[PDB]
Design an enzyme around this catalytic site. Structure first.
Site, PDB file in Angstrom:
ATOM      1  N   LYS B 151       0.824  -1.197   0.000  1.00 30.23           N
ATOM      2  CA  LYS B 151       0.000   0.000   0.000  1.00 30.23           C
ATOM      3  C   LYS B 151       0.865   1.256   0.000  1.00 30.23           C
ATOM      4  O   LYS B 151       0.337   2.353  -0.188  1.00 30.23           O
ATOM      5  CB  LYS B 151      -0.913   0.043   1.232  1.00 30.23           C
ATOM      6  CG  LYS B 151      -1.295  -1.305   1.873  1.00 30.23           C
ATOM      7  CD  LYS B 151      -2.477  -2.032   1.261  1.00 30.23           C
ATOM      8  CE  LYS B 151      -2.383  -3.516   1.643  1.00 30.23           C
ATOM      9  NZ  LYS B 151      -1.357  -4.261   0.852  1.00 30.23           N
ATOM     10  N   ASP B 171       6.696  -7.071  -6.898  1.00 34.32           N
ATOM     11  CA  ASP B 171       6.325  -7.797  -5.683  1.00 34.32           C
ATOM     12  C   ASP B 171       5.490  -8.989  -6.126  1.00 34.32           C
ATOM     13  O   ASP B 171       4.334  -8.796  -6.533  1.00 34.32           O
ATOM     14  CB  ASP B 171       5.485  -6.955  -4.715  1.00 34.32           C
ATOM     15  CG  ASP B 171       5.350  -7.597  -3.318  1.00 34.32           C
ATOM     16  OD1 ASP B 171       5.490  -8.836  -3.185  1.00 34.32           O
ATOM     17  OD2 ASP B 171       5.015  -6.871  -2.355  1.00 34.32           O
ATOM     18  N   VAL B 230      13.073   4.295   1.768  1.00 35.70           N
ATOM     19  CA  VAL B 230      12.158   5.056   2.595  1.00 35.70           C
ATOM     20  C   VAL B 230      11.356   4.077   3.456  1.00 35.70           C
ATOM     21  O   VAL B 230      10.456   4.463   4.222  1.00 35.70           O
ATOM     22  CB  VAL B 230      11.308   5.925   1.665  1.00 35.70           C
ATOM     23  CG1 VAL B 230      10.424   5.042   0.792  1.00 35.70           C
ATOM     24  CG2 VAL B 230      10.547   6.975   2.433  1.00 35.70           C
ATOM     25  N   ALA B 231      11.739   2.796   3.363  1.00 34.58           N
ATOM     26  CA  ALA B 231      11.092   1.673   4.026  1.00 34.58           C
ATOM     27  C   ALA B 231      11.876   1.226   5.256  1.00 34.58           C
ATOM     28  O   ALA B 231      11.621   1.721   6.360  1.00 34.58           O
ATOM     29  CB  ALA B 231      10.933   0.515   3.042  1.00 34.58           C
ATOM     30  N   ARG B 232      12.812   0.283   5.098  1.00 34.78           N
ATOM     31  CA  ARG B 232      13.584  -0.230   6.232  1.00 34.78           C
ATOM     32  C   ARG B 232      15.009  -0.525   5.818  1.00 34.78           C
ATOM     33  O   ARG B 232      15.256  -1.452   5.043  1.00 34.78           O
ATOM     34  CB  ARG B 232      12.960  -1.484   6.832  1.00 34.78           C
ATOM     35  CG  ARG B 232      11.480  -1.399   7.142  1.00 34.78           C
ATOM     36  CD  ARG B 232      10.907  -2.793   7.190  1.00 34.78           C
ATOM     37  NE  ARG B 232       9.817  -2.924   8.142  1.00 34.78           N
ATOM     38  CZ  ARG B 232      10.004  -3.285   9.402  1.00 34.78           C
ATOM     39  NH1 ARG B 232      11.204  -3.643   9.840  1.00 34.78           N
ATOM     40  NH2 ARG B 232       8.965  -3.297  10.237  1.00 34.78           N
ATOM     41  N   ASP B 256      15.814   7.697   3.937  1.00 34.72           N
ATOM     42  CA  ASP B 256      15.063   8.062   5.140  1.00 34.72           C
ATOM     43  C   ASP B 256      15.277   7.080   6.298  1.00 34.72           C
ATOM     44  O   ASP B 256      15.198   7.460   7.477  1.00 34.72           O
ATOM     45  CB  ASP B 256      13.564   8.122   4.819  1.00 34.72           C
ATOM     46  CG  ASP B 256      12.726   8.548   6.024  1.00 34.72           C
ATOM     47  OD1 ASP B 256      13.037   9.624   6.592  1.00 34.72           O
ATOM     48  OD2 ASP B 256      11.801   7.788   6.434  1.00 34.72           O
ATOM     49  N   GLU B 261      19.205   3.128  13.769  1.00 40.04           N
ATOM     50  CA  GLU B 261      18.785   4.517  13.877  1.00 40.04           C
ATOM     51  C   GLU B 261      18.783   4.933  15.340  1.00 40.04           C
ATOM     52  O   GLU B 261      18.208   4.214  16.165  1.00 40.04           O
ATOM     53  CB  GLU B 261      17.372   4.700  13.294  1.00 40.04           C
ATOM     54  CG  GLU B 261      17.010   3.678  12.231  1.00 40.04           C
ATOM     55  CD  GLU B 261      15.791   4.080  11.432  1.00 40.04           C
ATOM     56  OE1 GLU B 261      15.409   5.269  11.502  1.00 40.04           O
ATOM     57  OE2 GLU B 261      15.215   3.206  10.742  1.00 40.04           O
ATOM     58  N   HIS B 280      14.266   9.035   9.448  1.00 42.80           N
ATOM     59  CA  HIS B 280      12.972   8.354   9.542  1.00 42.80           C
ATOM     60  C   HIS B 280      11.816   9.345   9.635  1.00 42.80           C
ATOM     61  O   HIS B 280      10.853   9.131  10.376  1.00 42.80           O
ATOM     62  CB  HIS B 280      12.974   7.362  10.718  1.00 42.80           C
ATOM     63  CG  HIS B 280      11.984   6.238  10.577  1.00 42.80           C
ATOM     64  ND1 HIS B 280      10.686   6.436  10.153  1.00 42.80           N
ATOM     65  CD2 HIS B 280      12.124   4.899  10.741  1.00 42.80           C
ATOM     66  CE1 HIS B 280      10.053   5.275  10.108  1.00 42.80           C
ATOM     67  NE2 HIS B 280      10.908   4.325  10.449  1.00 42.80           N
ATOM     68  N   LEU B 281      11.914  10.440   8.881  1.00 40.90           N
ATOM     69  CA  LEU B 281      10.851  11.431   8.786  1.00 40.90           C
ATOM     70  C   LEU B 281       9.661  10.923   7.995  1.00 40.90           C
ATOM     71  O   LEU B 281       8.674  11.659   7.848  1.00 40.90           O
ATOM     72  CB  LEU B 281      11.391  12.703   8.131  1.00 40.90           C
ATOM     73  CG  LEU B 281      12.535  13.398   8.857  1.00 40.90           C
ATOM     74  CD1 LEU B 281      12.868  14.689   8.191  1.00 40.90           C
ATOM     75  CD2 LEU B 281      12.128  13.678  10.256  1.00 40.90           C
ATOM     76  N   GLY B 282       9.742   9.683   7.504  1.00 35.95           N
ATOM     77  CA  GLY B 282       8.811   9.131   6.541  1.00 35.95           C
ATOM     78  C   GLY B 282       7.363   9.363   6.889  1.00 35.95           C
ATOM     79  O   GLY B 282       6.485   9.322   6.020  1.00 35.95           O
ATOM     80  N   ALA B 283       7.119   9.614   8.180  1.00 39.00           N
ATOM     81  CA  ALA B 283       5.789   9.812   8.718  1.00 39.00           C
ATOM     82  C   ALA B 283       5.539  11.217   9.237  1.00 39.00           C
ATOM     83  O   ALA B 283       4.381  11.646   9.260  1.00 39.00           O
ATOM     84  CB  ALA B 283       5.529   8.812   9.851  1.00 39.00           C
TER      85      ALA B 283
END
Lengths: 305, 305
Positions: B151, B171, B230-232, B256, B261, B280-283
């Site tokens: 998603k 995927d 931008v995931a892990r 990110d 971290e 980790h500003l991703g959010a």
């Protein structure tokens, strides 16, 4: 049947190797008004990007021969285009590849102004780490306003409705058809001042819209509105954006163009938190290097038939 | 009649106002694993964003009563669901409001990386001026391979084709109708390594994927490929991202998320010209601040029926 063309400024080897196929090429870059004046005399066409003093005197100096002038890229006001058609001279510009790379480099400014991709990559490269300090906002349902619905700031809108914003523009000279098609609505001036979270400047700097963004127009806006300027940096009264940013009327700013490029090191929007500046990188993509180089090449050749 | 819920980590103000409507709320942010154990014993629900000491040992300490536990955010693997599975416990997450503004901050990393908005704004605030160093690339006809059609990566394809790119995703788990619907082609793995001008990571760190991106991986890629993680960050063998950014197989990288971290200061991906690192500003967007706060508030309130 061996035409002759002066290349006044550096130029894309994609292009030049076209011109060398249909002309003789003078790649004497950066020439004093004199060298030009003495050169112009002997050459059927001139090609320049926003940096060669072309004006009445250069026109007279050539006396016939100079049939067509090619301006490389965005703007045009480089050349005294009045003397152009007057001394019977053709004027062709190169604006398709530099519009892309422009409307691109603004999207890149808006998205990265909103998430602080700069000041964060700053503090993390500077050994810091403050997630609470650099917390972004969300360019989705946010109304973006565009001033100067030209070729640039319409290929911006094309992109921002792809990011999903509700994008409006304001320009008396923009056909309600081409705006309604790309997906935009055309709205009044103060409806674009007030009701905007994001503001994208695309106005040509003229005595008519100079210093437009003074302090009478910053109050109108929604507080917390964000500004991205990429087309003619004089249109902002920079010492009020210095003041709506410090006060908090304007949340963030991301400026590619300036009043005076390069602005002095004391210059207060260049050095500031809520600002994200690039030094007229507006068209600095390796694909509009080759793209403008080729398209004037193809323009000059066409008009020099 | 009067249910009861522990808030282990700071949670958004709107949602806490929601939780005090259908619970008693103990916001005891930052609990030692020992206090957690003693507290869990007496409460019907525990809620926790990325980062709380939950696991078997906590699960057992509560002995019934704890019906439901909510992971305030995207992640569902913050804890050993195996014991909730095993203990008649329900498990609810925030899979939407953090979805949007991660796809967002993804895009913005791609665009700001392409046009060097970080390394540029930096040196101009640093009193330089080098329009020629910080020359971009034109994310337009370009292929963006999205690894992982979650998603997250889907709604990055959404934005990315609006900037006008050729987006393929790979995927093995996404129905090609949910793909072809948004306009993206599903193709193979090596048709993603080899054909990609841009590579967006959206893989969770399954061991199988730990250090997937390694020198074998990088050699497969087109030279000049740009990598927006931008995931892990565990999925990238950082010591080799560094040696393809250095050796010039990877163009640029916008990162990110990291292996560990906050990373070591001296981390070569953190401190590197061709890398744009946000932490980790991703959010970190206020429309998913309030958004996650209210959705898991909602999510627990129901599971606590």
């Amino acid at each position: 049947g061996k035409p002759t063309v002066l290349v006044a400024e550096k130029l894309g080897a994609a292009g030049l190797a076209l011109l060398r196929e249909f002309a003789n090429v003078d790649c004497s870059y950066g020439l004093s008004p004199e060298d030009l004046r003495a050169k112009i005399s002997l050459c059927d066409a001139l090609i320049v990007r926003s940096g060669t003093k072309v004006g009445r005197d250069v026109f007279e100096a050539s006396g016939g021969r100079l049939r067509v002038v090619g301006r490389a890229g965005v703007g045009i006001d480089n050349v005294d285009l009045a003397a152009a058609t007057e001394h019977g001279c053709l004027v062709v510009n190169a604006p398709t590849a530099n519009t892309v790379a422009a409307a691109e480099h603004g999207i890149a400014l808006l998205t990265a102004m909103a998430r602080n991709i700069a000041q964060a990559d700053a503090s993390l490269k500077a050994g810091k780490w403050q997630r609470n300090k650099y917390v972004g906002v969300s360019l989705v349902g946010k109304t973006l306003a565009i001033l100067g619905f030209g070729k640039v700031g319409s290929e911006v809108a094309r992109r921002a409705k792809g990011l999903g914003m509700h994008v409006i523009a304001h320009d008396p000279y923009a056909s309600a058809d081409r705006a309604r098609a790309i997906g935009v609505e055309l709205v009044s001036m103060e409806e674009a001042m007030t009701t905007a979270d994001f503001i994208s400047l695309h106005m040509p700097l003229t005595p008519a819209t100079d210093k437009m963004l003074n302090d009478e127009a910053f109050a109108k806006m929604k507080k917390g509105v964000r500004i991205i300027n990429v087309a003619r940096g004089g249109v902002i009264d920079e010492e009020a954006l210095v003041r709506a940013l410090d006060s908090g009327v304007v949340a963030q700013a991301a400026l590619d163009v300036f009043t005076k490029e390069p602005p002095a090191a004391d210059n207060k929007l260049v050095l500031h938190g809520n600002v994200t500046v690039t030094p007229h990188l507006g068209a600095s993509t390796v694909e509009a290097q080759e793209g403008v180089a080729i398209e004037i090449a193809e323009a000059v050749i066409g008009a020099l038939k």
